[PDB]
Amino acid sequence: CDEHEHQCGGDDPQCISKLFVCDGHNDCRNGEDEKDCTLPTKAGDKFIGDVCFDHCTKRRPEHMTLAFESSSIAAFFTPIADLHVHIEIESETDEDESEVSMPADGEYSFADHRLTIHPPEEDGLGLVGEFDGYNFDRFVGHIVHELSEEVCAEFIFHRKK
Amino acid sequence: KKQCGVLEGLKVKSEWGRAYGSGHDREAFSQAIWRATFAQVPESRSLFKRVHGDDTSHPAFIAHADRVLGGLDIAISTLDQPATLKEELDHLQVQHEGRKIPDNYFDAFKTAILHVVAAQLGRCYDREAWDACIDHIEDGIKGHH
Amino acid sequence: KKQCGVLEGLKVKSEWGRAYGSGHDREAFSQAIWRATFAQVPESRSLFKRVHGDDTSHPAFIAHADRVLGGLDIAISTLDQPATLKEELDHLQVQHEGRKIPDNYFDAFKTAILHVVAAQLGRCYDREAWDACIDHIEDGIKGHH
Amino acid sequence: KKQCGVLEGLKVKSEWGRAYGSGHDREAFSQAIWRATFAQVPESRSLFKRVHGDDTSHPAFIAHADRVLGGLDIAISTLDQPATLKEELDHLQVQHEGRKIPDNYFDAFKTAILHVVAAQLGRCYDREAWDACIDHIEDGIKGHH
Amino acid sequence: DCCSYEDRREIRHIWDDVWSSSFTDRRVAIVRAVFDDLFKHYPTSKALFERVKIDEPESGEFKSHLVRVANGLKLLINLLDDTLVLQSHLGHLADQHIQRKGVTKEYFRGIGEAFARVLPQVLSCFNVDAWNRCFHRLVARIAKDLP
Amino acid sequence: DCCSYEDRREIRHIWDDVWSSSFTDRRVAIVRAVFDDLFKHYPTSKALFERVKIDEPESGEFKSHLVRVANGLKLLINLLDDTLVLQSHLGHLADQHIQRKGVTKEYFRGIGEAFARVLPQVLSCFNVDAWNRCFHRLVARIAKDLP
Amino acid sequence: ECLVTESLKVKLQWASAFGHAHERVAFGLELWRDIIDDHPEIKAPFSRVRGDNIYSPEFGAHSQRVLSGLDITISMLDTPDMLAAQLAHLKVQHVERNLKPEFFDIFLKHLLHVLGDRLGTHFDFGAWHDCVDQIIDGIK
Amino acid sequence: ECLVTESLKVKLQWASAFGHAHERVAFGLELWRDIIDDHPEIKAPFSRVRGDNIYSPEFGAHSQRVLSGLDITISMLDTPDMLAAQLAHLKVQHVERNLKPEFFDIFLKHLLHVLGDRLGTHFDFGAWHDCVDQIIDGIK
Amino acid sequence: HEHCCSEEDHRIVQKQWDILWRDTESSKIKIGFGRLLLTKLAKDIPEVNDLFKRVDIEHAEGPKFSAHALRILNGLDLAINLLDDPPALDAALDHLAHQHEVREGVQKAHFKKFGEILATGLPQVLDDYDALAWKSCLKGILTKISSRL
Amino acid sequence: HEHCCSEEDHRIVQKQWDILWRDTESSKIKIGFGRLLLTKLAKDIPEVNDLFKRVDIEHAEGPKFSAHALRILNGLDLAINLLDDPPALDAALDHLAHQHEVREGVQKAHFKKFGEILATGLPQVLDDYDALAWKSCLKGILTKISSRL
Numbered sequence A: 001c002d003e004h005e006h007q008c009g010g011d012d013p014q015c016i017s018k019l020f021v022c023d024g025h026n027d028c029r030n031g032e033d034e035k036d037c038t039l040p041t042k043a044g045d046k047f048i049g050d051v052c053f054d055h056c057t058k059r060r061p062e063h064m065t066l067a068f069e070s071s072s073i074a075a076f077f078t079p080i081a082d083l084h085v086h087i088e089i090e091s092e093t094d095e096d097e098s099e100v101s102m103p104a105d106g107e108y109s110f111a112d113h114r115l116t117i118h119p120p121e122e123d124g125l126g127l128v129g130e131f132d133g134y135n136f137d138r139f140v141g142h143i144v145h146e147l148s149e150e151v152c153a154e155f156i157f158h159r160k161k
Numbered sequence B, C, D: 001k002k003q004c005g006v007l008e009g010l011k012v013k014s015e016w017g018r019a020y021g022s023g024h025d026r027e028a029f030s031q032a033i034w035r036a037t038f039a040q041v042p043e044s045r046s047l048f049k050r051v052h053g054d055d056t057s058h059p060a061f062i063a064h065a066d067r068v069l070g071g072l073d074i075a076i077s078t079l080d081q082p083a084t085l086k087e088e089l090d091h092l093q094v095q096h097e098g099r100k101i102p103d104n105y106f107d108a109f110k111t112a113i114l115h116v117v118a119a120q121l122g123r124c125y126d127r128e129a130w131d132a133c134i135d136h137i138e139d140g141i142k143g144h145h
Numbered sequence E, F: 001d002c003c004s005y006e007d008r009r010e011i012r013h014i015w016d017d018v019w020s021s022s023f024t025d026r027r028v029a030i031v032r033a034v035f036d037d038l039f040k041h042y043p044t045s046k047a048l049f050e051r052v053k054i055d056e057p058e059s060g061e062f063k064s065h066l067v068r069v070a071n072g073l074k075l076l077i078n079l080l081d082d083t084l085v086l087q088s089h090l091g092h093l094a095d096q097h098i099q100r101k102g103v104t105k106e107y108f109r110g111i112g113e114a115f116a117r118v119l120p121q122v123l124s125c126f127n128v129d130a131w132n133r134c135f136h137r138l139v140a141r142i143a144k145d146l147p
Numbered sequence G, H: 001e002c003l004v005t006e007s008l009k010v011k012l013q014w015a016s017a018f019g020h021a022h023e024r025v026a027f028g029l030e031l032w033r034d035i036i037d038d039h040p041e042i043k044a045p046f047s048r049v050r051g052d053n054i055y056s057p058e059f060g061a062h063s064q065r066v067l068s069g070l071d072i073t074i075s076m077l078d079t080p081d082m083l084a085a086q087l088a089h090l091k092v093q094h095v096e097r098n099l100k101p102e103f104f105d106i107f108l109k110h111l112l113h114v115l116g117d118r119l120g121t122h123f124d125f126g127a128w129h130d131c132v133d134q135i136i137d138g139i140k
Numbered sequence I, J: 001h002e003h004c005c006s007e008e009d010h011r012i013v014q015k016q017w018d019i020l021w022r023d024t025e026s027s028k029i030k031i032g033f034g035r036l037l038l039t040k041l042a043k044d045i046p047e048v049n050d051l052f053k054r055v056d057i058e059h060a061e062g063p064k065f066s067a068h069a070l071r072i073l074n075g076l077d078l079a080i081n082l083l084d085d086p087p088a089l090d091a092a093l094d095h096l097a098h099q100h101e102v103r104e105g106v107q108k109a110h111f112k113k114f115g116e117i118l119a120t121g122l123p124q125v126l127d128d129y130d131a132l133a134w135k136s137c138l139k140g141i142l143t144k145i146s147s148r149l
């Protein structure tokens, strides 16, 4: 489907606007746009990310925990769930040994199972993890420059169960 | 929390450019906005009985919606030309006075716009700024504050 | 990031007054500094073998430490009298040339001083300023930059 | 089976260019080589105790390795300038004499290099040639034959 | 205080948001809004622009000026990928201000603060730090001999 | 733009850091450094002090002057707790400058900027705003009839 | 005569043609090269900005500064009061040198030739000629 | 004056520009065409190698032989003894014909113009001018 | 009669009409362009000046008119942007018909002219213009708008 | 202070420094280049000539020095090639510090100059040079190498 449209799949495809996925109205013939609206990263949940390509983070850490503090959905706009998250980090050098727990806002779009976590520090670096669609216990987390949308760090996040 | 001044205008005027978009994105952008509005105050559906407000997907209404955003465009697109904006707002003011539209609805419609715009722009979007300007624009249509 | 000029001098000269202090605060201030230095470059302990560098708490070394800060005092305490300072620095320069002291150590010792001073002054302390001046003072002892 | 003459030199010098490579390939190429060396004569680990020979993956050693190949580079890279090579080899010779390095180790290290290089070059690689030259280079470092 | 390549990229983008239209209107209001902040803080500098008629804000003799300033900045940013040339024009840009009697090293550090207070208001997603960093490197070289 | 009691307290302290020693040396260099910033920005004013021999920086006829200025400021600050007296000497301080032909209302706003640029460099923990606020209240009354 | 549309057209095409970042330096360079090869007499006044070696950074800088000004003027075609002023301002920075008024007629010739390549057949020659001309006369 | 780096720079750029196989003939052709159109007086001495039809194999061959020699000279900029000799050798193969020393000044003009296109803005004009010049005078 | 302004046709128009709104200063453009378009209309047919009197057409640069310039020009936008949804576009235009029906003085011949003007103007601001496609679509639009007079 | 010679920064440096070793005759280059670099240093600061006396700097083309030219130039290589592994690079450079510490006569001002020279030289052999990136990295390197004098 086009750039800003959601595919309903099935043996008979139909493109509808992403702004319609999980909105409360049955926009797709088959209904996909409304039958799979479960929020993965919900309050209380924790996700552990294993680095594998880091060209920007200030700590170039081995891991990176992602704790979800709160999550609320606006009663009239179901397509987007707003989140509050603490990004924890365990660094350790020669001259010192730091720990961090930067807090950031963010939303999760049922439209494409992609949670965007707004930049925590004023260094223009934000996290963007897009979900499998069917998994929800593992998502690739790309650290990017919000403005540009440049990828410069990939972490595989696993739901800490 | 902030007033729709010179800069905050330029910002909204620019961001609106991206959120508004064109073609289908538009036909939906408006769609989304109205759905969000009506969802908030179902009471208001009664005012658009003339333009099939019952079915948000009816061409008549689609037109209406796409037609409304149109004005909002002119409004925003001229937040840097008080002279002209003044006029457009005044013009709108007229097309609306007479209809028992409570400040209650405008409020919802603003919220709608804001939520949708935010959904559309992803990350680069100043809330306060829009709030401030959408407000100034609405005031110009009601006459109130 | 800044040069040890007129003002930046007065600032360091003043702040140093507070950090240096006297009596026990001093006997410790120095203690802390050296511990921080040696912790950075354990290699350097070998140079103070003559004054019990092995045990930072040995009177001999305590003396040494308290004796070192002493010079640093004279240095800082005269950043507003180039004429005199020049002399003191030069004097020190001599007591040091001959010993294979790498710019590597001076660097650590500066860091040490800075960290301790910052720990001692709490909030009112300009980092850049000290860095700049401690530098100018060290340069005057090495001969280099 | 062959002597490191004019041509056999050019060949090794060229092939080495490909095998040595740069960046990570290098940091590994060296890694591989050393692992192959130590695996042959674990006894030798004791000589690099100074540069963390215990853990081949320790930065200190990584440096060391990358640093060693460096010389080997200069050596090979000048097999066509006896005048200069002579000097580099002699220079190395010094940095090594004094250390009880048996012709036993050099042998293993050569083998290591050869096996890794062969693994890296795939098909285009003359064994005899390298053997001959790595030898000539090693001789220049030991003083022996 | 080093202008990283990433930072350059950041700006090379941030700019594309302020310098969007090929119509003066926008850039003008911004550069103006920048100066108004310079004058509200270092009122002394105001006098320096009587030559362009600042007493007549909407003059045009002045508006054009604002634009030249804007464009001069634009030219800088749009040079961040060609270092060597930037390094030269950056000098040339200094000389054009050294011969302008009355321009202090301070006024520059002042206009720097200006942008850092204005820009974050005309557009969202502004990496104030990144901007600040590379802007300083640019300013430093411009007013190295200015004080 | 109101000099709060808290602000007064802030200053009554900030000062105790610049006016520490009872030896001229320090206060001199500071007040000087202040004027040097006044002259670099409003060069016209320079001429006004030929009476004290500014052409001879280390003169002494001039150094003493600097001190008097310093001390005059000191006297002000050290009066912030006795309002009524401050309000009077503050006037007397005006009259001493009104009879000084050539002193503009501007030069004052200029020396104000001066401190706000100098002080933050001679000592840390400087509440630039607090200073600015109470300094303006002091200046305003001094040059009310000066322009 | 450059009215309202004939401007917007240029303002617009200038955008695509000129470009951004490096794309510009390339433009500037290509332009000046063609100009200097046609009339080497120009390498003279460009002595201050190493006009002998147009690939040099010194000249490169210049090249850019120039194009930039051209950008300004073009971005002022809609507002007369600013253009008239800007143009007058440019005339001064030039008059101070032995500049044969024909040099500009040359500059224009090429600027169009180049935009021709960049823009292709869409290039509205008419609009540009009528419009850039007005900018030159104000400096000639 | 072509020192050590100013050479390596050319030696390197020549590589990318010139190219390999066909890529070269293309270069040669493009070069000579531009040269002959500018100064048709040259079609004269090139009579032996069908200079009238530069696309012909006869001329094509020539074209290549030329560039090749240029390659040699350039690859000798670092070693003076070989260059001085090579250059002298080339001068002889030329002097034997009515060759206006200005022809070479022309050849150079274009060789640079062409490399300019091929290499782009990276093209180190300075280095080349200083360096290729030194190769021409040894033949002029 | 059904091959006029086809999918490809308008897909084209739409694409070309967008070349315009690439820069954020759409207002300055829409206005200037719409301003000129209406002016050039009153030029060829003066009985128009009286119709646009209500919006102070006398002062082309006057906000009163500048606003109008937008409304109209912006309406044309709406028309174009709904080209890919006949029923909607239809409704959208019918509405425009009514907004012109109650404005006495406005006769068909006016639109015919405005059309010719619009067709001569567009290609002056758009480097890529497909006269055939546009004429096809503009016709359908202008007609449906004036179908009440 | 931590934005100096960043990942992108050195990723660049590394890429650009490689443009050099494309041809197998690296020796001829490294030497010639390193030779020139040191020469131009002794040119601006003679007290250097005595330091490099040990390696017969008197005979630039002399194998004694040519070898040296490599060693140094090659060390710079090592530095650059370890830019993507701070701990290793650190160690690698610290080692270089010690190799210079025991060589009396060598003072900081020397490196500062060598840096300026290196920065004016590189762009003469590399068509693609990013002064900003390089200066950032070369600084970090040169500094850490001379941090003992």
Ligand code: HEM
Pocket: B044, B047, B048, B050, B051, B067, B068, B070, B071, B072, B075, B092, B095, B096, B099, B101, B105, B106, B107, B109, B137, B138, B141
């Ligand atoms: C800033 C927000 C608003 C703007 C810019 C705006 C704009 C418009 C515009 C342009 C029209 C079409 C006029 C025409 O062409 O005939 C319109 C019609 C109308 N508006 Fe608004 N409007 C706004 C808010 C509201 C609100 C809050 C309500 C009430 C829920 C409302 C109710 C109406 C109604 C009922 C109509 C007429 C429908 C019809 O044509 O039958 N508007 N509005």
Ligand code: HEM
Pocket: C044, C047, C048, C050, C051, C067, C068, C070, C071, C072, C075, C092, C095, C096, C099, C101, C105, C106, C107, C109, C137, C138, C141
């Ligand atoms: C700005 C910092 C420094 C100052 C002001 C300074 C000052 C002093 C002073 C005053 C003395 C005592 C001289 C005497 O009375 O005999 C001294 C001794 C010495 N300094 Fe420094 N020094 C500084 C940095 C260093 C550094 C970096 C090292 C090396 C780690 C160092 C190594 C020595 C040694 C080994 C002695 C002699 C110990 C002895 O008496 O046996 N100094 N220094």
Ligand code: HEM
Pocket: D044, D047, D048, D050, D051, D067, D068, D069, D070, D071, D072, D075, D092, D095, D096, D099, D101, D105, D106, D107, D109, D137, D138, D141
């Ligand atoms: C042709 C092969 C060899 C070459 C080219 C070579 C080269 C080098 C180089 C350049 C160094 C570093 C010198 C410095 O910068 O301080 C070095 C160090 C050393 N080499 Fe070799 N080497 C070779 C074979 C060997 C062998 C066979 C051994 C023994 C297993 C060995 C043992 C050492 C040791 C222990 C060091 C010093 C480690 C330290 O710095 O603490 N080398 N070698």
Ligand code: HEM
Pocket: E045, E048, E049, E051, E052, E068, E069, E072, E073, E096, E097, E100, E103, E104, E107, E108, E109, E111
């Ligand atoms: C952000 C850095 C700045 C840039 C990029 C910039 C750019 C420019 C440019 C391009 C010119 C016009 C040259 C010409 O066309 O003749 C100019 C002139 C000048 N600049 Fe700046 N400038 C900057 C900051 C400043 C500052 C901080 C001051 C101090 C208040 C200043 C004062 C002036 C003055 C007074 C002129 C003369 C204008 C005239 O009378 O024509 N500039 N500047």
Ligand code: HEM
Pocket: F045, F048, F049, F051, F052, F068, F069, F072, F073, F096, F097, F100, F103, F104, F107, F108, F109, F111
């Ligand atoms: C911060 C506020 C200022 C204070 C507290 C201050 C204080 C003083 C004092 C105490 C005197 C000496 C009176 C005497 O002993 O006869 C004085 C004189 C004078 N002040 Fe100020 N002053 C201030 C600002 C200024 C400014 C802004 C100017 C203008 C440039 C200025 C110009 C003068 C001059 C020229 C004299 C005469 C000195 C002489 O020739 O003896 N003052 N001021």
Ligand code: HEM
Pocket: G042, G045, G046, G048, G049, G062, G065, G066, G067, G069, G070, G073, G090, G093, G094, G097, G099, G103, G104, G107, G135, G136, G139
């Ligand atoms: C219509 C295109 C032209 C425009 C818009 C224009 C613009 C400029 C600008 C803005 C400068 C830079 C002034 C500065 O910042 O110092 C400049 C300088 C100059 N222009 Fe032009 N110019 C144009 C055509 C010409 C022509 C035809 C010539 C060719 C002879 C010419 C000769 C010069 C010279 C010699 C300089 C000064 C070089 C220097 O800075 O040393 N310009 N031009």
Ligand code: HEM
Pocket: H042, H045, H046, H048, H049, H062, H065, H066, H067, H069, H070, H073, H090, H093, H094, H097, H099, H103, H104, H107, H135, H136, H139
């Ligand atoms: C710097 C570039 C030049 C180089 C390196 C060069 C090289 C050569 C070489 C190697 C040959 C082939 C000789 C052979 O194998 O028989 C040749 C032939 C010749 N060159 Fe050049 N040449 C250059 C410039 C010129 C110029 C400027 C002219 C133009 C008038 C010229 C005129 C000739 C002629 C007429 C021949 C002989 C054609 C024939 O074989 O019948 N050359 N040149």
Ligand code: HEM
Pocket: I048, I051, I052, I054, I055, I071, I072, I073, I075, I076, I079, I096, I099, I100, I103, I106, I107, I110, I111, I114, I141, I142, I145
């Ligand atoms: C395809 C082009 C046209 C479009 C899309 C269009 C659009 C509009 C719009 C939106 C309005 C404003 C309605 C409102 O908000 O109250 C309007 C009003 C009007 N139109 Fe058109 N129009 C077009 C062509 C024409 C033509 C050819 C004439 C010429 C006689 C015309 C004459 C008028 C008049 C007189 C008004 C009244 C404006 C007022 O005083 O408020 N229109 N048109």
Ligand code: HEM
Pocket: J048, J051, J052, J054, J055, J071, J072, J073, J075, J076, J079, J096, J099, J100, J103, J106, J107, J110, J111, J114, J141, J142, J145
């Ligand atoms: C970043 C550039 C530099 C690098 C990477 C570097 C690298 C080296 C290396 C590898 C050695 C040889 C150690 C050995 O194998 O025994 C060395 C030695 C030396 N370096 Fe540096 N060096 C640099 C800059 C300098 C500077 C600026 C000076 C200038 C005073 C300097 C002076 C020396 C001296 C005198 C030696 C002794 C050579 C001998 O006689 O064996 N180096 N350097």
Ligand SMILES: [Ca+2]
Pocket: A020, A021, A022, A023, A024, A025, A026, A027, A028, A033, A034
């Ligand atoms: Ca739906």
